[PDB]
mmCIF file of all heavy atoms in Angstrom:
data_model
loop_
_atom_site.group_PDB
_atom_site.id
_atom_site.type_symbol
_atom_site.label_atom_id
_atom_site.label_comp_id
_atom_site.label_asym_id
_atom_site.label_seq_id
_atom_site.Cartn_x
_atom_site.Cartn_y
_atom_site.Cartn_z
ATOM 1 N N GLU A 48 -0.691 9.814 -2.232
ATOM 2 C CA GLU A 48 0.091 10.144 -3.410
ATOM 3 C C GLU A 48 -0.501 11.411 -4.025
ATOM 4 O O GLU A 48 0.214 12.250 -4.480
ATOM 5 C CB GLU A 48 0.006 9.018 -4.491
ATOM 6 C CG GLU A 48 0.736 7.696 -4.117
ATOM 7 C CD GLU A 48 2.217 7.790 -4.273
ATOM 8 O OE1 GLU A 48 2.721 8.767 -5.003
ATOM 9 O OE2 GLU A 48 2.971 6.941 -3.751
ATOM 10 N N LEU A 49 -1.853 11.453 -4.022
ATOM 11 C CA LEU A 49 -2.590 12.569 -4.524
ATOM 12 C C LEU A 49 -2.354 13.836 -3.775
ATOM 13 O O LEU A 49 -2.339 14.981 -4.338
ATOM 14 C CB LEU A 49 -4.079 12.258 -4.622
ATOM 15 C CG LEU A 49 -4.692 11.788 -5.975
ATOM 16 C CD1 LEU A 49 -3.703 11.418 -7.004
ATOM 17 C CD2 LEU A 49 -5.669 10.635 -5.724
ATOM 18 N N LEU A 50 -2.206 13.736 -2.474
ATOM 19 C CA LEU A 50 -1.973 14.847 -1.606
ATOM 20 C C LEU A 50 -0.525 15.268 -1.743
ATOM 21 O O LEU A 50 -0.120 16.358 -1.256
ATOM 22 C CB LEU A 50 -2.195 14.519 -0.067
ATOM 23 C CG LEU A 50 -3.613 14.289 0.367
ATOM 24 C CD1 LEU A 50 -3.620 13.790 1.813
ATOM 25 C CD2 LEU A 50 -4.336 15.625 0.260
ATOM 26 N N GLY A 51 0.327 14.486 -2.401
ATOM 27 C CA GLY A 51 1.668 14.802 -2.591
ATOM 28 C C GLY A 51 2.506 14.589 -1.302
ATOM 29 O O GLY A 51 3.598 15.191 -1.209
ATOM 30 N N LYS A 52 2.090 13.731 -0.424
ATOM 31 C CA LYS A 52 2.742 13.508 0.790
ATOM 32 C C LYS A 52 3.633 12.227 0.901
ATOM 33 O O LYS A 52 3.236 11.169 0.515
ATOM 34 C CB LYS A 52 1.728 13.403 1.938
ATOM 35 C CG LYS A 52 0.782 14.601 2.033
ATOM 36 C CD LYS A 52 1.286 15.675 3.024
ATOM 37 C CE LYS A 52 2.661 16.178 2.718
ATOM 38 N NZ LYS A 52 3.044 17.390 3.575
ATOM 39 N N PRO A 53 4.846 12.392 1.381
ATOM 40 C CA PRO A 53 5.736 11.154 1.488
ATOM 41 C C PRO A 53 5.076 10.306 2.559
ATOM 42 O O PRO A 53 4.451 10.857 3.486
ATOM 43 C CB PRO A 53 7.045 11.769 1.969
ATOM 44 C CG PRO A 53 7.089 13.161 1.347
ATOM 45 C CD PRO A 53 5.687 13.586 1.586
ATOM 46 N N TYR A 54 5.154 8.971 2.463
ATOM 47 C CA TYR A 54 4.591 8.112 3.502
ATOM 48 C C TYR A 54 5.333 6.832 3.665
ATOM 49 O O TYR A 54 5.987 6.278 2.738
ATOM 50 C CB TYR A 54 3.124 7.836 3.193
ATOM 51 C CG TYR A 54 2.864 7.190 1.865
ATOM 52 C CD1 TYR A 54 2.774 5.755 1.779
ATOM 53 C CD2 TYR A 54 2.812 7.911 0.680
ATOM 54 C CE1 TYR A 54 2.635 5.159 0.599
ATOM 55 C CE2 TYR A 54 2.604 7.274 -0.536
ATOM 56 C CZ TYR A 54 2.531 5.942 -0.581
ATOM 57 O OH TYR A 54 2.396 5.257 -1.824
ATOM 58 N N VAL A 55 5.238 6.306 4.902
ATOM 59 C CA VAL A 55 5.852 5.032 5.269
ATOM 60 C C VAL A 55 5.245 3.815 4.567
ATOM 61 O O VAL A 55 4.051 3.749 4.364
ATOM 62 C CB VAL A 55 5.840 4.857 6.774
ATOM 63 C CG1 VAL A 55 6.341 3.435 7.169
ATOM 64 C CG2 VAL A 55 6.655 5.924 7.432
ATOM 65 N N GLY A 56 6.088 2.802 4.212
ATOM 66 C CA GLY A 56 5.589 1.630 3.600
ATOM 67 C C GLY A 56 5.450 1.529 2.099
ATOM 68 O O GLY A 56 5.784 2.435 1.333
ATOM 69 N N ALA A 57 4.913 0.386 1.640
ATOM 70 C CA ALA A 57 4.728 0.125 0.247
ATOM 71 C C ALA A 57 3.767 1.092 -0.474
ATOM 72 O O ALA A 57 2.830 1.607 0.143
ATOM 73 C CB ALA A 57 4.174 -1.344 0.095
ATOM 74 N N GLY A 58 4.100 1.337 -1.715
ATOM 75 C CA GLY A 58 3.281 2.228 -2.531
ATOM 76 C C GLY A 58 1.964 1.566 -2.920
ATOM 77 O O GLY A 58 1.587 0.503 -2.401
ATOM 78 N N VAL A 59 1.266 2.205 -3.868
ATOM 79 C CA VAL A 59 -0.014 1.694 -4.355
ATOM 80 C C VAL A 59 0.074 0.301 -4.976
ATOM 81 O O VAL A 59 -0.680 -0.639 -4.575
ATOM 82 C CB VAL A 59 -0.672 2.645 -5.303
ATOM 83 C CG1 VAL A 59 -1.950 2.083 -5.922
ATOM 84 C CG2 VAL A 59 -0.970 3.956 -4.572
ATOM 85 N N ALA A 60 0.916 0.153 -5.967
ATOM 86 C CA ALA A 60 1.091 -1.142 -6.683
ATOM 87 C C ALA A 60 1.470 -2.277 -5.756
ATOM 88 O O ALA A 60 0.793 -3.319 -5.727
ATOM 89 C CB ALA A 60 2.122 -0.951 -7.828
ATOM 90 N N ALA A 61 2.535 -2.108 -5.004
ATOM 91 C CA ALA A 61 2.968 -3.183 -4.073
ATOM 92 C C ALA A 61 1.906 -3.541 -3.050
ATOM 93 O O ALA A 61 1.646 -4.744 -2.801
ATOM 94 C CB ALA A 61 4.241 -2.772 -3.334
ATOM 95 N N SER A 62 1.241 -2.587 -2.401
ATOM 96 C CA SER A 62 0.171 -2.835 -1.488
ATOM 97 C C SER A 62 -0.993 -3.532 -2.081
ATOM 98 O O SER A 62 -1.480 -4.563 -1.546
ATOM 99 C CB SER A 62 -0.333 -1.496 -0.851
ATOM 100 O OG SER A 62 0.687 -0.826 -0.133
ATOM 101 N N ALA A 63 -1.469 -3.086 -3.275
ATOM 102 C CA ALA A 63 -2.615 -3.729 -3.885
ATOM 103 C C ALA A 63 -2.331 -5.110 -4.283
ATOM 104 O O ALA A 63 -3.154 -6.009 -4.250
ATOM 105 C CB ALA A 63 -3.074 -2.905 -5.068
ATOM 106 N N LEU A 64 -1.068 -5.382 -4.738
ATOM 107 C CA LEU A 64 -0.689 -6.676 -5.235
ATOM 108 C C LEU A 64 -0.503 -7.680 -4.034
ATOM 109 O O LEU A 64 -0.972 -8.774 -4.134
ATOM 110 C CB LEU A 64 0.626 -6.652 -6.063
ATOM 111 C CG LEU A 64 0.471 -6.400 -7.517
ATOM 112 C CD1 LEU A 64 -0.346 -5.181 -7.779
ATOM 113 C CD2 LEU A 64 1.857 -6.290 -8.195
ATOM 114 N N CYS A 65 0.131 -7.202 -3.012
ATOM 115 C CA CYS A 65 0.446 -8.040 -1.858
ATOM 116 C C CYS A 65 -0.859 -8.418 -1.076
ATOM 117 O O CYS A 65 -0.858 -9.369 -0.258
ATOM 118 C CB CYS A 65 1.372 -7.393 -0.860
ATOM 119 S SG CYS A 65 3.057 -7.385 -1.528
ATOM 120 N N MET A 66 -1.963 -7.779 -1.354
ATOM 121 C CA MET A 66 -3.258 -8.072 -0.704
ATOM 122 C C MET A 66 -4.094 -8.964 -1.576
ATOM 123 O O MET A 66 -5.235 -9.276 -1.247
ATOM 124 C CB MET A 66 -3.953 -6.764 -0.378
ATOM 125 C CG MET A 66 -5.124 -6.989 0.588
ATOM 126 S SD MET A 66 -5.071 -5.741 1.871
ATOM 127 C CE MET A 66 -4.035 -6.536 2.985
ATOM 128 N N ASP A 67 -3.647 -9.241 -2.840
ATOM 129 C CA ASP A 67 -4.417 -10.098 -3.740
ATOM 130 C C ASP A 67 -3.692 -11.462 -3.745
ATOM 131 O O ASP A 67 -2.682 -11.651 -4.367
ATOM 132 C CB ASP A 67 -4.401 -9.494 -5.117
ATOM 133 C CG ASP A 67 -5.226 -10.351 -6.097
ATOM 134 O OD1 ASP A 67 -5.131 -11.573 -6.081
ATOM 135 O OD2 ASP A 67 -5.997 -9.761 -6.855
ATOM 136 N N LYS A 68 -4.289 -12.447 -3.030
ATOM 137 C CA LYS A 68 -3.695 -13.779 -2.946
ATOM 138 C C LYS A 68 -3.524 -14.433 -4.318
ATOM 139 O O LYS A 68 -2.669 -15.305 -4.478
ATOM 140 C CB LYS A 68 -4.609 -14.672 -2.098
ATOM 141 C CG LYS A 68 -4.804 -14.189 -0.631
ATOM 142 C CD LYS A 68 -5.748 -15.067 0.171
ATOM 143 C CE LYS A 68 -5.969 -14.577 1.555
ATOM 144 N NZ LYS A 68 -6.702 -13.276 1.589
ATOM 145 N N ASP A 69 -4.299 -14.010 -5.312
ATOM 146 C CA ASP A 69 -4.202 -14.575 -6.658
ATOM 147 C C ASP A 69 -3.071 -13.922 -7.475
ATOM 148 O O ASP A 69 -2.132 -14.657 -7.926
ATOM 149 C CB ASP A 69 -5.539 -14.449 -7.376
ATOM 150 C CG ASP A 69 -5.370 -14.725 -8.888
ATOM 151 O OD1 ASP A 69 -4.816 -15.772 -9.232
ATOM 152 O OD2 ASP A 69 -5.837 -13.873 -9.686
ATOM 153 N N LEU A 70 -3.158 -12.633 -7.716
ATOM 154 C CA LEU A 70 -2.101 -11.970 -8.512
ATOM 155 C C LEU A 70 -0.724 -12.041 -7.913
ATOM 156 O O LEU A 70 0.241 -12.207 -8.632
ATOM 157 C CB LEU A 70 -2.527 -10.446 -8.705
ATOM 158 C CG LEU A 70 -3.907 -10.239 -9.418
ATOM 159 C CD1 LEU A 70 -4.066 -8.711 -9.613
ATOM 160 C CD2 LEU A 70 -3.942 -10.912 -10.779
ATOM 161 N N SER A 71 -0.639 -11.909 -6.584
ATOM 162 C CA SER A 71 0.707 -11.927 -5.943
ATOM 163 C C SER A 71 1.334 -13.305 -6.181
ATOM 164 O O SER A 71 2.547 -13.400 -6.394
ATOM 165 C CB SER A 71 0.606 -11.666 -4.484
ATOM 166 O OG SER A 71 -0.235 -12.627 -3.802
ATOM 167 N N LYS A 72 0.558 -14.378 -6.145
ATOM 168 C CA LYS A 72 1.107 -15.706 -6.386
ATOM 169 C C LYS A 72 1.568 -15.872 -7.856
ATOM 170 O O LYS A 72 2.578 -16.551 -8.103
ATOM 171 C CB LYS A 72 0.098 -16.774 -6.005
ATOM 172 C CG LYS A 72 -0.069 -16.937 -4.482
ATOM 173 C CD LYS A 72 -1.138 -17.916 -4.140
ATOM 174 C CE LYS A 72 -1.344 -17.998 -2.659
ATOM 175 N NZ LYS A 72 -0.187 -18.565 -1.943
ATOM 176 N N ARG A 73 0.818 -15.289 -8.773
ATOM 177 C CA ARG A 73 1.168 -15.425 -10.181
ATOM 178 C C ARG A 73 2.531 -14.790 -10.369
ATOM 179 O O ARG A 73 3.379 -15.293 -11.084
ATOM 180 C CB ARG A 73 0.095 -14.769 -11.018
ATOM 181 C CG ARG A 73 -1.317 -15.276 -10.772
ATOM 182 C CD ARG A 73 -2.325 -14.663 -11.669
ATOM 183 N NE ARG A 73 -2.428 -15.483 -12.911
ATOM 184 C CZ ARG A 73 -3.323 -16.440 -13.104
ATOM 185 N NH1 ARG A 73 -4.210 -16.693 -12.177
ATOM 186 N NH2 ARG A 73 -3.286 -17.161 -14.256
ATOM 187 N N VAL A 74 2.724 -13.579 -9.728
ATOM 188 C CA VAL A 74 3.972 -12.921 -9.889
ATOM 189 C C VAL A 74 5.158 -13.655 -9.290
ATOM 190 O O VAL A 74 6.161 -13.861 -9.919
ATOM 191 C CB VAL A 74 3.972 -11.479 -9.263
ATOM 192 C CG1 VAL A 74 5.368 -10.891 -9.235
ATOM 193 C CG2 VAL A 74 3.038 -10.617 -10.054
ATOM 194 N N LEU A 75 4.967 -14.096 -8.028
ATOM 195 C CA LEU A 75 6.026 -14.788 -7.381
ATOM 196 C C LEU A 75 6.369 -16.186 -8.001
ATOM 197 O O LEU A 75 7.495 -16.573 -8.135
ATOM 198 C CB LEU A 75 5.609 -15.055 -5.862
ATOM 199 C CG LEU A 75 5.405 -13.853 -5.009
ATOM 200 C CD1 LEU A 75 4.887 -14.221 -3.647
ATOM 201 C CD2 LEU A 75 6.675 -13.016 -4.888
ATOM 202 N N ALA A 76 5.347 -16.825 -8.490
ATOM 203 C CA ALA A 76 5.568 -18.154 -9.128
ATOM 204 C C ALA A 76 6.433 -17.974 -10.400
ATOM 205 O O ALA A 76 7.306 -18.719 -10.653
ATOM 206 C CB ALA A 76 4.262 -18.824 -9.519
ATOM 207 N N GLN A 77 6.074 -16.926 -11.167
ATOM 208 C CA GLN A 77 6.781 -16.611 -12.410
ATOM 209 C C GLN A 77 8.226 -16.249 -12.081
ATOM 210 O O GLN A 77 9.120 -16.501 -12.870
ATOM 211 C CB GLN A 77 6.047 -15.464 -13.152
ATOM 212 C CG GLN A 77 6.714 -15.059 -14.478
ATOM 213 C CD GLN A 77 7.962 -14.251 -14.278
ATOM 214 O OE1 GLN A 77 8.152 -13.590 -13.251
ATOM 215 N NE2 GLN A 77 8.878 -14.235 -15.239
ATOM 216 N N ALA A 78 8.428 -15.591 -10.948
ATOM 217 C CA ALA A 78 9.751 -15.152 -10.533
ATOM 218 C C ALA A 78 10.598 -16.279 -9.925
ATOM 219 O O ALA A 78 11.782 -16.112 -9.798
ATOM 220 C CB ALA A 78 9.597 -13.999 -9.510
#
């Protein structure tokens, strides 16, 4: 993102959240 380069896959927020078994579950449960 800092290099300003387009890239494949999830961005920073989605990647960081999907790798946190705790926070991701809180979001999905609420949803």
Side-chain angles (χ1 to χ4, degrees):
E48 290 285 341
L49 260 14
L50 287 174
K52 306 265 58 171
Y54 60 93
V55 173
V59 174
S62 299
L64 272 54
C65 289
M66 193 134 273
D67 182 319
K68 302 178 181 67
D69 167 50
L70 302 182
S71 62
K72 285 174 185 296
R73 308 183 86 95
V74 171
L75 299 175
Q77 181 284 335

